[PDB]
């Protein structure tokens, strides 16, 4: 039916699952994978 495309075409979804997953800020892996590799190196 047309109702589906009628609604989905005008609505807006600001947040979804992945949006929840990522932090709102800027937290890159540079400060993380560094330790992730250091620990392995010691092992």
């Amino acid at each position: 039916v047309d109702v589906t495309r009628d609604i989905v075409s005008r609505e807006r979804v600001w947040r979804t699952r992945t949006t929840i997953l990522q932090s709102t800020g800027k937290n890159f892996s540079k400060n993380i994978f560094a330790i992730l590799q250091s620990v392995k190196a010691r092992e």
């Binding site: 109702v3 699952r17 892996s29 993380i32 330790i35 620990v39």
Partner: protein
């Protein structure tokens, strides 16, 4: 920038604020609310034209995320009225506007502690548009609240059948199996159905796999080179999701978890540092950070976290939180108050054996702490014997129970011998209590 430019000047602006809000929805909700507020009043000077229902619906939606639940409800009702007034707006489909307005209103009522009205409104949507998904799923969630085997489990699968290409529905199907973890290894298949490249990349399902693979941890079979491989597989999943997304907090969370399991608590704090700094308002981070603290002989820094996690309006006495609360407590305030919280927990559900065992253990700890090296107040010696007797009765009772905490409690015999020699010591120290009594007596004389 363009909106900023137009805002200052007033070239008879009518719709500029509409755009302002339309952009600000993702950003600070209040900016959009203010934009809508000013826009509402800018639409009555040129003519006496009733505000279109869409704007009022959108502002009510903004409020819905806020505490203005009643105000948002009034907005939604007015939007429904106005949309109904749109008899000649078939091209704009006033019907769809009313549909979304009612959907939002039902969501609010479900959030307003009125599930009857939420169900009624969702069913009013269903009767007129069965091809819709979200309401069919919210009804299932509402029925799930009472129980996971009720029409929730059926409505979710039916929603998937009518739309198998809906990630939300399939993830919900994946969630159904979470209530019963007996599908530990088997839930991999149902969680890999939609991992096809067309759906990829999907971080939600990948993190679900990482979790269900982490759940397998905490077993005594690690020495069999089995839990190590599981750790390695989970770590690899986390690394991949980290590479493809460096801003996903949950990957870092799971990495910190596995490192703690690897024994790097001194190093677990650093990794959990970033996740906490991003957003500490997630149940898991509190508990993991408390785990690290309590591991370092810091109950001072752990009990507060456990309390804060319990500050949420979901429960008051959770069993797991208290179980993690009493780890190495030996101080006066961490034994008697530990008993208080233990009773609080067992109050909601006494059926657990672990509570009945920890209570007796702390009872014995206190009894020996006052009946071995004391030589303390007398009335305490009077109460210690009653406490030890109750601990002994519980020791007798706990032995007859079949199932245990995945570990048989046949090791209560040492507890019985401890209680026996404690009884002997108490019968010995009551004499000391009497001597102290006669001492204070001759003193006052």
């Amino acid at each position: 920038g363009h909106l900023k430019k137009v805002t200052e000047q007033y070239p008879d602006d009518v719709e500029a604020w509409i755009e302002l809000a339309q952009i600000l929805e993702q950003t600070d909700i209040q900016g959009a609310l203010s934009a809508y507020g000013t826009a509402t009043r800018i639409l009555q000077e040129k003519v006496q034209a009733d505000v279109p229902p869409e704007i009022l619906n959108n502002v009510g939606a903004l409020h819905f995320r806020l505490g203005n639940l009643g105000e948002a409800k009034k907005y939604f009702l007015a939007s429904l009225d106005r949309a109904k007034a749109e008899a000649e707006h078939d091209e704009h489909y006033y019907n769809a506007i009313s549909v979304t307005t009612s959907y939002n209103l039902a969501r609010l009522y479900e959030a307003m502690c009125e599930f009857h009205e939420a169900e009624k409104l969702y069913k009013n949507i269903l009767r007129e548009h069965p091809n819709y998904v979200d309401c069919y799923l919210r009804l299932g969630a509402m029925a799930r609240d009472k129980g996971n085997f009720y029409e929730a489990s059926d409505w979710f699968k039916e929603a998937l059948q009518i739309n198998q290409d809906h990630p939300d529905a399939w993830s919900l199907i994946g969630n159904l199996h979470l209530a019963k973890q007996e599908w530990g290894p088997g839930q991999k298949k149902f969680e890999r159905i939609l991992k096809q490249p067309s759906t990829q990349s999907d971080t939600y399902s990948m993190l679900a796999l990482g979790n269900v693979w982490l759940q397998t941890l905490h077993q005594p079979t690690r020495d069999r080179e089995k839990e190590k491989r599981h750790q390695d597989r989970a770590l690899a999943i986390y690394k991949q999701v980290l590479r493809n997304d460096a801003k996903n907090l949950y990957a870092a969370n799971g990495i910190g978890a596995v490192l703690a399991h690897k024994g790097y608590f001194r190093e677990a704090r650093d990794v959990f540092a970033q996740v906490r700094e991003a957003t500490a308002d997630i149940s898991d981070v509190w508990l993991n950070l408390a785990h690290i603290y309590v591991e370092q002989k810091q109950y001072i820094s752990a009990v507060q976290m456990y309390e804060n996690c319990l500050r949420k309006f979901y429960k008051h006495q959770n069993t797991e939180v208290v179980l993690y609360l009493a780890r190495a407590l030996f101080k006066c305030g961490k034994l008697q108050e530990c008993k208080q919280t233990l009773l609080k927990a067992r109050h909601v559900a006494p059926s657990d054996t672990v509570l009945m065992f920890n209570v007796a253990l702390v009872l014995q700890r206190l009894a020996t702490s006052v009946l071995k090296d004391e030589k303390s107040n007398l009335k305490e010696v009077l109460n210690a014997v009653k406490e030890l007797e109750l601990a002994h009765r519980y020791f007798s009772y706990l032995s007859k129970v079949g199932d245990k905490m995945r570990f048989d409690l046949a090791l209560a015999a040492t507890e019985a011998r401890q209680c026996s020699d404690l009884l002997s010591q108490a019968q010995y120290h009551v004499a000391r209590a009497r001597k102290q009594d006669e001492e204070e007596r001759e003193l006052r004389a």
